[PDB]
Design a binder for these strands. Structure first.
Ligand SMILES: [Mn+2]
Ligand SMILES: [Mn+2]
Ligand SMILES: [Mn+2]
Ligand SMILES: [Mn+2]
Length: 175
DNA sequence: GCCTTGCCGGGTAA
DNA sequence: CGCGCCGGAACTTAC
DNA sequence: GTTCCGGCGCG
DNA sequence: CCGGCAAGGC
């Protein structure tokens, strides 16, 4: 119940700023990766990491939270077939999220992909379907919004949250 | 004259 | 033999 | 954000 | 993602 909320949030960080990777190496080795990337050293070590750790403990995943420093970004990485299938199986069921999970996921996605100036309230992604699902969630939460193709260079869509519901959006989802 | 939201280009944080 | 956890990091582009 | 590399370890 | 701009509704 409370793992599901933290799970939906992390999944928001993952879909937005990360990935679920099933790799086949030379040969025939394999690896399963759960990844969140972020520029802010602080956000990843003091906020995201401890949340991933709770989840890991709670699932008895005996893998380690790895934090790899790259030049443009920090990468939080858990190398684990179990955690991989945990998030992937949850992603499969995204349409069945309850309110707690919807809210947590949107918060995760916004932290990852959102307009963080909060001047406007916007979310970016190539995945129109994902944005459509979030859009319905926002509507049933009283947050009006529209989706259109924003960047023709890269087929990136944007979900714009109406400034008319700025407050309902900011306190319900982001807080 | 003001507010909201679609348009679109730059380049950094994915 | 086939397969799953570490530790980087070069590489491209979607935010 | 994605996928290479060479490492070690399992039965 | 950011952020200037302008079309258009009030
Ligand atoms: Mn993304
Ligand atoms: Mn992103
Ligand atoms: Mn236990
Ligand atoms: Mn981000």
């Amino acid at each position: 119940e409370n793992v599901s909320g933290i799970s939906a949030y992390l999944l928001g960080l993952i879909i937005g700023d990360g990935g679920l990777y099933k790799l086949k190496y030379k040969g025939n080795r394999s690896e399963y990766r759960v990844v969140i990337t972020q520029k802010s050293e602080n956000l990843i070590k003091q906020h995201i990491a401890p949340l991933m750790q709770f989840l890991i403990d709670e699932l008895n995943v005996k893998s380690k939270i790895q934090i790899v420093k790259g030049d443009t970004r920090y990468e939080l990485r858990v190398s684990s077939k179990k955690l991989y299938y945990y998030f992937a199986n949850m992603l499969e069921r995204i349409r069945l999220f309850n309110m707690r999970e919807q809210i947590a996921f949107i918060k995760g996605l916004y932290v990852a992909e959102g307009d963080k100036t909060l001047k406007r309230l916007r979310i970016w992604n190539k995945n129109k379907a994902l944005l459509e699902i979030v859009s319905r969630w926002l509507n049933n939460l009283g947050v009006r919004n529209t989706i259109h193709l924003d960047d023709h260079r890269h087929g990136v869509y944007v979900l714009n949250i109406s400034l008319r519901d700025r407050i309902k959006f900011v306190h319900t989802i982001l807080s």
